[PDB]
Design a protein around this ligand. Structure first.
Ligand SMILES: [Cu+2]
Ligand SMILES: [Li+]
Length: 75
């Protein structure tokens, strides 16, 4: 996945989301993502994270450990 592809996939799959991606260790391998989306309001963190995994569509190997997640509804 090229730089920016994680963010692109999240925003395509969760329309309206605000996404902040940081590359842990600058390593091109493990990342952290913050995703803020109205569709998350009232959902649990487990339910919100499920929506993010869905948006990546299996394109990121090892996503369970390789994409550390923070999610919320807009403030
Ligand atoms: Cu790994
Ligand atoms: Li990284």
């Amino acid at each position: 996945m090229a730089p920016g592809d994680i963010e692109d996939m999240i925003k395509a799959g969760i329309p309206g989301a605000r996404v902040t991606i940081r590359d842990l260790a600058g390593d091109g391998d493990h990342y952290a993502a913050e995703v803020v989306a109205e569709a998350f309001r009232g959902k649990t963190r487990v339910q919100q994270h499920q929506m993010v995994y869905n948006a990546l569509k299996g394109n990121m190997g090892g996503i369970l450990h390789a994409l550390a997640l923070q999610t919320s509804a807009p403030e």
